[PDB]
Amino acid sequence: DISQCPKIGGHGSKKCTGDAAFCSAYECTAQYANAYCSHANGSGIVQIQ
Amino acid sequence: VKEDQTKFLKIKTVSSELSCREGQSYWTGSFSPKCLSSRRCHLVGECH
Ligand SMILES: *[C@@H]1O[C@H](CO)[C@@H](O)[C@H](O)[C@H]1NC(C)=O
Protein backbone atom coordinates (compact mmCIF):
# COMPACT_ATOMS: atom_id res chain seq x y z
CA ASP A 1 0.00 0.00 0.00
CA ILE A 2 1.60 3.24 -1.18
CA SER A 3 -0.26 5.22 1.50
CA GLN A 4 2.45 4.16 3.96
CA CYS A 5 5.51 5.43 2.08
CA PRO A 6 6.13 9.05 3.13
CA LYS A 7 5.67 11.86 0.66
CA ILE A 8 8.59 14.16 -0.06
CA GLY A 9 9.12 16.49 2.89
CA GLY A 10 6.55 14.56 4.90
CA HIS A 11 5.93 11.78 7.40
CA GLY A 12 5.30 8.09 6.84
CA SER A 13 5.26 4.72 8.54
CA LYS A 14 7.39 2.52 6.26
CA LYS A 15 10.74 2.97 4.55
CA CYS A 16 10.13 2.94 0.82
CA THR A 17 12.31 2.94 -2.30
CA GLY A 18 11.55 3.06 -5.99
CA ASP A 19 12.52 4.17 -9.48
CA ALA A 20 13.23 7.67 -10.80
CA ALA A 21 9.59 8.80 -10.94
CA PHE A 22 8.87 7.57 -7.41
CA CYS A 23 11.98 9.27 -6.05
CA SER A 24 10.94 12.50 -7.76
CA ALA A 25 7.43 12.26 -6.30
CA TYR A 26 7.95 10.51 -2.96
CA GLU A 27 10.84 10.41 -0.48
CA CYS A 28 13.21 7.54 -1.26
CA THR A 29 14.92 6.21 1.85
CA ALA A 30 18.64 5.87 2.52
CA GLN A 31 18.20 2.91 4.88
CA TYR A 32 17.05 -0.65 4.23
CA ALA A 33 13.74 -0.37 2.39
CA ASN A 34 10.49 -2.24 3.03
CA ALA A 35 8.93 -2.14 -0.45
CA TYR A 36 9.77 -1.26 -4.05
CA CYS A 37 7.52 1.26 -5.81
CA SER A 38 7.77 1.38 -9.59
CA HIS A 39 5.85 3.77 -11.88
CA ALA A 40 2.79 2.38 -13.63
CA ASN A 41 3.33 0.97 -17.13
CA GLY A 42 0.53 2.96 -18.77
CA SER A 43 -1.50 4.73 -16.09
CA GLY A 44 -2.50 8.38 -16.09
CA ILE A 45 -5.58 10.43 -16.89
CA VAL A 46 -7.51 9.62 -20.06
CA GLN A 47 -9.43 12.37 -21.85
CA ILE A 48 -11.96 11.83 -24.63
CA GLN A 49 -12.66 14.30 -27.43
CA VAL B 1 -52.57 -12.79 -109.96
CA LYS B 2 -53.42 -9.40 -111.45
CA GLU B 3 -55.89 -7.44 -109.30
CA ASP B 4 -54.94 -9.82 -106.47
CA GLN B 5 -52.09 -10.46 -104.01
CA THR B 6 -49.48 -7.67 -104.62
CA LYS B 7 -47.88 -7.93 -101.18
CA PHE B 8 -45.23 -5.32 -100.41
CA LEU B 9 -42.36 -5.81 -97.96
CA LYS B 10 -40.65 -2.54 -97.05
CA ILE B 11 -37.33 -1.84 -95.34
CA LYS B 12 -37.30 1.69 -93.94
CA THR B 13 -33.83 3.07 -93.15
CA VAL B 14 -34.44 4.91 -89.88
CA SER B 15 -30.96 6.25 -89.14
CA SER B 16 -27.25 5.45 -89.33
CA GLU B 17 -25.18 6.07 -86.20
CA LEU B 18 -21.50 5.67 -85.32
CA SER B 19 -21.88 3.79 -82.06
CA CYS B 20 -19.09 3.26 -79.54
CA ARG B 21 -17.38 -0.03 -78.68
CA GLU B 22 -16.36 0.37 -75.04
CA GLY B 23 -13.16 -1.15 -73.73
CA GLN B 24 -12.07 -0.93 -70.10
CA SER B 25 -14.19 0.81 -67.48
CA TYR B 26 -14.33 1.65 -63.79
CA TRP B 27 -16.44 3.52 -61.26
CA THR B 28 -15.78 6.46 -58.97
CA GLY B 29 -17.51 8.80 -56.56
CA SER B 30 -17.01 11.36 -53.81
CA PHE B 31 -15.15 10.29 -50.66
CA SER B 32 -14.25 11.98 -47.38
CA PRO B 33 -11.96 10.65 -44.63
CA LYS B 34 -12.55 10.05 -40.94
CA CYS B 35 -9.68 9.60 -38.49
CA LEU B 36 -9.43 8.10 -35.01
CA SER B 37 -6.42 9.14 -32.94
CA SER B 38 -4.85 7.69 -29.80
CA ARG B 39 -1.76 9.18 -28.14
CA ARG B 40 0.34 7.05 -25.79
CA CYS B 41 3.55 7.80 -23.93
CA HIS B 42 6.79 5.93 -24.55
CA LEU B 43 7.05 2.24 -23.63
CA VAL B 44 3.23 2.03 -23.48
CA GLY B 45 1.66 -0.56 -25.75
CA GLU B 46 3.67 -0.48 -28.98
CA CYS B 47 5.12 3.00 -28.46
CA HIS B 48 8.63 1.67 -28.99
C1 LIG C 1 4.52 -1.65 -19.70
O1 LIG C 1 3.12 -1.76 -20.01
C2 LIG C 1 2.78 -1.83 -21.40
C3 LIG C 1 1.28 -1.82 -21.48
O2 LIG C 1 0.75 -0.54 -21.14
C4 LIG C 1 3.40 -3.09 -21.97
O3 LIG C 1 3.05 -3.22 -23.35
C5 LIG C 1 4.91 -3.00 -21.82
O4 LIG C 1 5.51 -4.19 -22.31
C6 LIG C 1 5.30 -2.81 -20.35
N1 LIG C 1 6.74 -2.61 -20.24
C7 LIG C 1 7.53 -3.35 -19.45
C8 LIG C 1 6.85 -4.44 -18.67
O5 LIG C 1 8.73 -3.16 -19.38
Side-chain angles (χ1 to χ4, degrees):
Chain A
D1 189 10
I2 200 189
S3 69
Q4 323 175 245
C5 314
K7 288 211 56 53
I8 182 173
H11 172 67
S13 59
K14 292 302 192 62
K15 291 170 285 167
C16 209
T17 196
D19 58 358
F22 179 80
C23 285
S24 73
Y26 285 76
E27 159 184 353
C28 290
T29 191
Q31 320 180 1
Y32 182 62
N34 294 125
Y36 185 79
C37 286
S38 182
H39 174 255
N41 272 85
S43 197
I45 287 179
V46 173
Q47 294 195 304
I48 193 61
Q49 181 142 243
Chain B
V1 154
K2 193 43 197 166
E3 276 80 48
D4 298 84
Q5 288 317 297
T6 67
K7 304 315 289 297
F8 289 58
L9 185 89
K10 288 327 199 76
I11 318 292
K12 205 41 175 58
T13 309
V14 171
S15 61
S16 157
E17 46 266 39
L18 209 47
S19 277
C20 160
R21 172 123 56 77
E22 323 176 1
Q24 311 131 354
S25 158
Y26 60 79
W27 292 68
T28 178
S30 278
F31 302 115
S32 95
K34 296 298 185 65
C35 50
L36 320 158
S37 67
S38 165
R39 200 186 83 79
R40 313 300 299 284
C41 301
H42 198 250
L43 301 172
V44 191
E46 327 96 310
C47 203
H48 325 126

